[PDB]
Symmetry: D2
Subunit: 295 residues, 4 copies
């Protein structure tokens, strides 16, 4: 037997950082959960009990806090790139670092219509994420994403004209509820290293905001022919607005809400045009994915 | 042996309802999870296998959907009261109904600065809840609550002057992070029945909004001496603003964020006035409760 | 306004303890999650920002570890009683301690048919719990429980003869699946204090084992007329076998498995006597409770 | 823009099946959660709103139940292969099916030392899983796994001799607790189609049992130099015992249990040789992975 692939590191490292503006008294907080996995010439720790090649996972944890102390933690694309680069530059035998960051929402509170200087609310479970792969000699690959964005529209979704055969019971519909939890990822063109990532810093927050905006607007405005058709429209627009993105991927559950026939009870009408009360279904759910790139 | 207490019913009944304004085209959605438990002269189903006294839990589920079809589902205090009253009026041998409702957020989307007619976002995991106990001959007892409201302030929290003995290692502090998930309940004066609940309908949404507002403002503005002191200020204000509330209860975790001493690393300063990077602690957590009533 | 009730302390305190037999080399591990809440003359911490009455929750955490170091942690009824007693004896102004303990399973591994001296498996998510209320002048009240015991029987459950009216669609059945997650609590007679709890130490593990055994055997062997009828049989037996128990409470979800009619597909028969494939339902679920005491 | 990759289908399909032996009266239950995703010539559903190419996800759900009715559901490697093959044979334009199955434990109860004919216990949250990729013209690729197997050993784990630099605070140790949740995957050699999978049916359960056995025994008996070294020993043995496996992958969290220094309290000794009470850490955790193949 031989080691074909190996990676190790620290997961679930929770980190908070505060910035205090001394002039204005305004404080801004950031909270993230970080995972760093390393690869390199470490096979002997597996095969020979040779711990000399192991940067202890406890040390990786320390490094994350130290790096957060000495560097900006926003945008997460930049922080992840700094963190990953550190390991390949510091340790000769480490040749790749994989950094995953989940950013948690702390939204400044408005109190009596004014932004509060130091109070925050978790206004959603939506996350902004990054995956950064720093590979020696091969640059920096960054995938940015939003996830946990949960939406519903109560009309202007249709689903008809699908394949019908002896396995099919689903009725065609011209008016249904559509609800999903959005997971969208945009993959950046490869960057040559930290200098290039730094040069593009303003684009990261802007592109996240654009991806969010396009997702929400398209969802709300599309008279949807299917999840497939609507998600394609989203991806197309994002690629159009940011030339440094190579691909956009969406992964969308179709969270079903079923009509409830109540006609057995005193002829009560609650289906089709008369449908008012529905049963949200916890499972099963459709799952629809697509990756869209450039011609 | 004898049956001392017994209750049974249906839990986790998910319900969605849509209202469609035909004039304006605006749609409004409500989604809830409902539990109904009944009590009454049902001992024989336990002791004698006498199912004749059992309103099947499946029938309770049907009843919830039928009631939602025929009645407004908002405010939840009203819907729960209608639902509970139904069971004690319909079944001679059922003498109490306990209705718990969790309302899920579907907040109307703003698209290009205008409210969308039929698109919604789950903008938080915060819930609005009710517990309604309808007891034959004893009226309707309603407890309203908000839960899952997660907040953090990065300064203007202190904790000093506590008991110090041989079990104590905690240092006094004049500047710390304070973060919690708010669970607040207000208990209404007993209502004589549905007519009285109906007479107070406008107060329910108003009081929920006030409780939320007071909670957030007090949290943000109090230079907090402790969780205990700050929560008392909240409860006091709520009781002052709504005379039909008898008691207010808060249950608050203290979600700790610890300083990280980095001085071992190149004399790096990250404690006290120099603290920037903190380690959020998943557990353990302080838990502080109080129930405040009228003099 | 006035403080009507107040309690505070530390939740989610994870604790592990190892016992090492030096003669045999056998090691035994215990892992628990502990919550301790205190009550007493502490109103002024809420109303006057008087922290002098507060035993810091951090100190409560320290106390739990210290107590675990100096005392046996099994049975949990004993440990909880020691822990609760500590607070009321140590602090003059603390008059009640509430201790909740969840014991996690670490079952010794059998390797090649022999018990391993120091290796363990979490063989189930089932818990053994205690709630101990130590109230000055009023003794020690202990409720013991098991929870998270998940079972299913594929036949020998019936449900017929229930009330049928215009809300009823459920068909009577003489053969169904029955599945539940068992939550069972037995409440001990009040104990005068620690000496009395110590005097009964052997009964605690024995009664837990008996409660588990009776639950499983009754479930497996009863040709069940309903959840209500079967659970009553369990409670009756437990009360019969341990005279120091005053009440037994069961809380049982009915986790439904629905038949799937496949007759639309090539006349496939999958209902009634021909039912083989079923759809487990995540929600809603029946919820059935009962508390059984002595005549 | 162009569609680079697309797949869609149904997730979270819960399925139960019962087998009833009419001779012996013994019943055996199987419960699984199934996901099926399809790929093929479906781009136009995304780009042109052409639903004619879509096998509705609701139909996929129906197909799963129908297939479970007409075929054995065990071993899951066989069922997944039947299910995947169905879609590529039935639909000309579908060229790949991806089937993921999670098997849930229903272990027969022993009552009074004898196996019960129809009563079952969920004796662990451990799962047995399969991922089956059926690709037209390319055969059937099967990855089998166990997950959620949670173990702890209280001694006979060491960790010393790792890299020490200015980021390192971790002390070397010759005696620590080791605990993990095992996720292990074995990948089968490619099979040419269903006939070949059928020919190997007995190997599937046998190899799962062997993988479990080797994992547990190695964990219990290895005087572990590190997670890396111990996991390599497991993978090596599995590859040795089943020649039709090409690779074995382990992914293991290191679930840390920290010593608690109690010396501040009356000189209490609870570290090193005197360590009895530990603090299990919920996060962060080490994460160690490796994939082992043949020379
Ligand atoms: O077994 C271990 N492997 C590691 O890589 C490691 N790093 N810190 N502690 C550790 N333990
Ligand atoms: O055992 C049962 N008890 C009940 O009360 C019930 N109601 N519907 N099905 C049921 N099954
Ligand atoms: O606000 C607080 N209240 C308390 O009771 C406490 N105990 N430790 N830290 C604390 N903070
Ligand atoms: O939007 C949808 N896409 C699908 O593929 C599908 N299948 N069933 N319902 C559906 N809705």
């Amino acid at each position: 037997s031989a080691v074909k692939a190996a990676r190790y590191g620290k997961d679930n490292v929770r980190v908070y950082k505060v910035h205090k503006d001394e002039k204005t008294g305004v404080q801004t907080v950031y909270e993230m959960t970080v995972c760093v996995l390393l690869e390199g010439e470490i096979e002997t720790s597996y095969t020979k009990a040779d711990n000399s090649v192991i940067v202890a996972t406890d040390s990786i944890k320390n490094t994350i806090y130290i790096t957060a102390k000495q560097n900006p933690v926003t945008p997460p694309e930049l922080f992840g790139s700094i963190l990953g680069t550190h390991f390949i530059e510091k340790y000769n035998h480490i040749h790749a670092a994989h950094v995953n960051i989940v950013c948690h929402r702390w939204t400044r509170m408005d109190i009596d219509g004014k932004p509060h200087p130091h109070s925050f609310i978790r206004d959603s479970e939506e996350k902004r994420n990054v995956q950064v792969d720093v590979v020696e000699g091969k640059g920096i690959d960054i995938k940015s994403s939003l996830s946990g964005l949960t939406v519903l529209k109560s009309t202007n979704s249709q689903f008809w004209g699908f394949l019908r055969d002896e396995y099919t019971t689903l009725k065609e519909t011209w008016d249904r509820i559509l609800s999903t939890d959005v997971d969208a990822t945009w993959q950046w063109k490869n960057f040559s290293g930290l200098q290039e990532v730094r040069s593009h810093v303003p684009k990261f927050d802007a592109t996240w905001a654009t991806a969010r905006e396009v997702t929400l607007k398209t969802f709300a405005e599309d008279n949807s022919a299917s999840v497939q058709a609507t998600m394609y429209k989203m991806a197309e627009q994002i690629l159009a607005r940011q030339q440094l993105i190579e691909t956009v991927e969406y992964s969308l559950p179709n969270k079903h809400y079923f009509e409830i026939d109540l006609s057995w009870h005193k002829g009560l009408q609650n289906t089709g045009k008369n449908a008012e009360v529905f049963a949200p279904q916890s499972d099963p759910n459709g799952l629809i994915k697509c990756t869209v790139g450039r011609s």
